[model samples]
Target: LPSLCYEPADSGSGTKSEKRIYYNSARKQCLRFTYNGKGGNANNFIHTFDCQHTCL
Candidate 1:
């Protein structure tokens, strides 16, 4: 199943500062990004990267 973990950015700035950690259990890959708008805004996401191992 697909799951997500979230955290608050240490330095909350920009349009938004909350961080979202997305994990794809089926793929065994993960990604991280910061919010750029209000809530659940995918547009203008920042600090994107891929996990080298399982996200769990």
Candidate 2:
């Protein structure tokens, strides 16, 4: 995995946001988040498995 796991989770910067998951390097674990749009970025995921797949 790349440092995108360390990249700060951006749930969403747009007007609309949805529930998401991201690797939390701060906690060194997966975390829930609000994510949507391009601003949300690759760090956001729809499920813990997916988050773990990339971030872990």
Candidate 3:
């Protein structure tokens, strides 16, 4: 299993904002700038880091 957490970027401080959590197994990682097979635009609008985890 994996988790995706997001928060608004800090104004000045380097520290990130409070944690906004979510789970995504198939959508494992954050979206990045890429193109689909049909040559579609894929903007990288992800604001979080992709974390890998295991559910025991």
Candidate 4:
């Protein structure tokens, strides 16, 4: 058997001023995963990031 885990996308529709949004399922607001620099993949961003409050 196998287990499954899931995460929802940050459907925040706003300008760059907003850095965080609410996650209805978790009952908390989470910061969206973004590349530190454009044209780079998650791996590159992950290396620069020390931690992320991923999910509840």
Better TM-score candidate (1, 3): 1
Top TM-score hit: 2
Q: Where is the poorest 10-residue window by lDDT in model 2?
A: 34-43
TM-score, candidate 2, is 0.75
> Residue-wise lDDT of candidate 2 within 1-56, one digit each (tens)?
68678778886667766778889987878888876665756677779998887866
lDDT of 3 by residue, 1-56 (tens): 21212322122323444332222334644433322223211122223343222211
How many residue pairs clash in model 4?
Answer: 0
Cα lDDT of model 1 by residue, 6-54, tens digit:
2222233457556655443455545555554455521222433433332
Relative to the unseen true structure, what is the C-alpha lDDT of residue 53 in candidate 1, on a scale of 0 to 100?
32
Full-model lDDT, candidate 1 = 0.41
lDDT of 4 by residue, 11-54 (tens): 23444432233232344433444322233222211321221233
Query: Over 4 Å off in model 3, which ranges?
Result: 2-19, 30-56
Clashing pairs in 2: none
Q: Model 4: which residue pairs collide?
A: none
CA lDDT, every model vs. true structure = 0.41, 0.78, 0.28, 0.30
Taking all chains together, the TM-score of candidate 3 against the true structure is 0.18
Least lDDT summed over 10 consecutive residues: which range in candidate 4?
Answer: 42-51
